[PDB]
């Protein structure tokens, strides 16, 4: 009853799943049931400061939803019939869960990820997913593409280790090089 009344009265619901509470996946936010009703009003701030923030957030949300559906079907029917796009979605969303969504609040690099760092890392992950999708649609097999771009995947997944104490200028400078290198490593491989 307390949870129902609180959900009825509040505007932002950060649901926590104990499955992710275990296995040390903090924050254990359940991205399927959680919702925020301030995304509409926050469009003014987003367009003022980080214009691509809402679009990137929507793209990540739809990627997570597609991967949830794919994992649900795979867990009962295996992953021997998925398409290349489905494999890309599953891999990128597993990467997002392992690196972006999970944040070690007691580690120096991930104690506090500011808004600009979060936006830049969303840009990095979404650009990785888009580059993989485009490269595979061009004709590249996903297995060979992953074998060739494991370095780019590791660089993207290790972007959380960039300490925000260096400042916005330093961290954003490294991220701009991360996207440029990732774009090159997806064109040379393809």
């Amino acid at each position: 009853p307390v949870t129902t009344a609180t959900l009825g009265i509040t505007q932002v619901f950060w649901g926590l799943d104990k499955k992710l509470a275990q296995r040390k996946h903090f924050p254990s936010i359940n991205t399927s049931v959680s919702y925020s009703k301030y995304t509409n009003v926050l469009n003014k701030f987003y367009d003022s400061n980080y214009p691509e923030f809402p679009v990137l957030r929507d793209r990540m949300k739809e990627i997570l939803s597609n991967a949830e559906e794919l994992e649900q079907v795979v867990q009962l029917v295996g992953k021997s019939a998925l398409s290349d796009s489905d494999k890309i979605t599953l891999d990128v969303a597993t990467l997002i869960k392992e690196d972006f969504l999970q944040q070690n609040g007691y580690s120096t690099y991930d104690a506090f990820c500011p808004i600009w760092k979060t936006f830049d890392m969303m840009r990095a992950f979404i650009s990785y997913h888009d580059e993989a999708q485009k490269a595979v649609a061009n004709g590249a097999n996903w297995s060979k593409l992953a074998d060739s771009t494991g370095d780019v995947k590791h660089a993207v997944s290790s972007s959380k280790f960039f300490e925000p104490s260096r400042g916005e200028k330093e961290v954003h400078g490294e991220f701009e090089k991360l996207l440029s290198t990732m774009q090159e490593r997806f064109a040379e491989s393809t």
């Binding site: 867990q75 009962l76 029917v77 295996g78």
Partner: protein, 214 residues
């Protein structure tokens, strides 16, 4: 590990029906998998026997072709390739119903439109050429039978793999899932009944206090 079902008596009955159907499907699909596995073992044995027979027939056909070529004094391969306008031998697929699967079975056929062989213009050894052609036709029929058996074996292997995966999924996922959903629904309705019982006990206490006062 539980289905997102609102605790209700109708929901409880629906989930009990789902559990019974899941158990029935588990048993039926396990039995179907066993039957298809017996059929697949038989198909594997038949495939091994057909491979041995096809090897023997290929050796015999090679010997016959060598004898025919020696009798003719030259290779008839060029003449056969030249006279390849149409194929006299054709294979038509048949959707045989083996157990619960629908494995297709190849059925060979002979077209008399281009049944004429390259015996004419071979120079010599017409009888040897005809005998070699008959031996090769028999070997081609045997190879068609072996190919049909191999295709049936592959289809049965795929069907058995899918069925075994379905049985394992049904059991391990659904039966714990539906059982946990049943347990949660029973617990929730037990809690609602307990709350109603407590409210009625409070009502009885108030009524008894009022009666004692009066």
């Amino acid at each position: 590990n539980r289905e997102q079902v609102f605790p209700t008596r109708m929901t409880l009955g629906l989930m009990k029906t789902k559990l019974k159907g899941a158990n029935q499907g588990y048993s039926l699909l396990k039995r179907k998998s066993e039957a298809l596995t017996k059929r697949f073992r038989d198909i594997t044995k038949r495939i091994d026997d057909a491979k041995q027979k096809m090897g023997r027939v290929m050796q015999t056909a090679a010997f016959s072709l060598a004898e025919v070529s020696y009798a003719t004094g030259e290779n008839i391969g060029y003449q056969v390739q030249e006279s390849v306008s149409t194929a006299r031998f054709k294979v038509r697929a048949r959707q045989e119903n083996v157990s619960g699967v629908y494995l297709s079975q190849f059925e060979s056929y002979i077209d008399p439109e281009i049944n004429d062989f390259r015996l004419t213009g071979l120079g010599r050894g017409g009888q040897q050429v005809q005998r070699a052609k008959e031996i090769y036709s028999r070997a081609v029929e045997t190879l068609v039978e072996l190919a049909s058996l191999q295709t049936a074996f592959i289809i049965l292997d795929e069907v058995i793999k899918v069925t075994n995966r379905r049985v394992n999924a049904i059991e391990h996922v659904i039966i714990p899932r539906t059982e946990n959903t049943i347990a949660y629904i029973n617990s929730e309705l037990d809690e609602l009944d307990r709350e109603e019982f407590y409210r009625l006990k409070k009502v009885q206490e108030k009524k008894q206090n009022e009666t004692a006062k009066l």
